[PDB]
Amino acid sequence: LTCFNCGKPGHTARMCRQPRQEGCWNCGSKEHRFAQCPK
């Protein structure tokens, strides 16, 4: 259970009102996003 938008656990992007993160909230790259990242 983790937000695929802001990158905070305990919810889902479905539920999240917040706008997306810059890049990989998961791994930390700015160039790519979480959805892009192999991880």
The binder of Zn ion chosen from 3, 10, 14, 30 (CB under 5 A) = 3
Sole binder of Zn ion in the list 16, 20, 25, 31 (CB under 5 A): 16
CB of 17 to Zn ion, least distance (A): 8
Give which of 10, 22, 25, 13 is closest to 37, Cα–Cα. Answer: 25
Residue pointed to by tokens 């305990």:
10
* Residue 6 touching Zn ion (CB under 5 A): yes
Count residues binding Zn ion (CB under 5 A): 9
Residue pair 23/31 in contact (Cβ under 8 Å)? The answer is yes
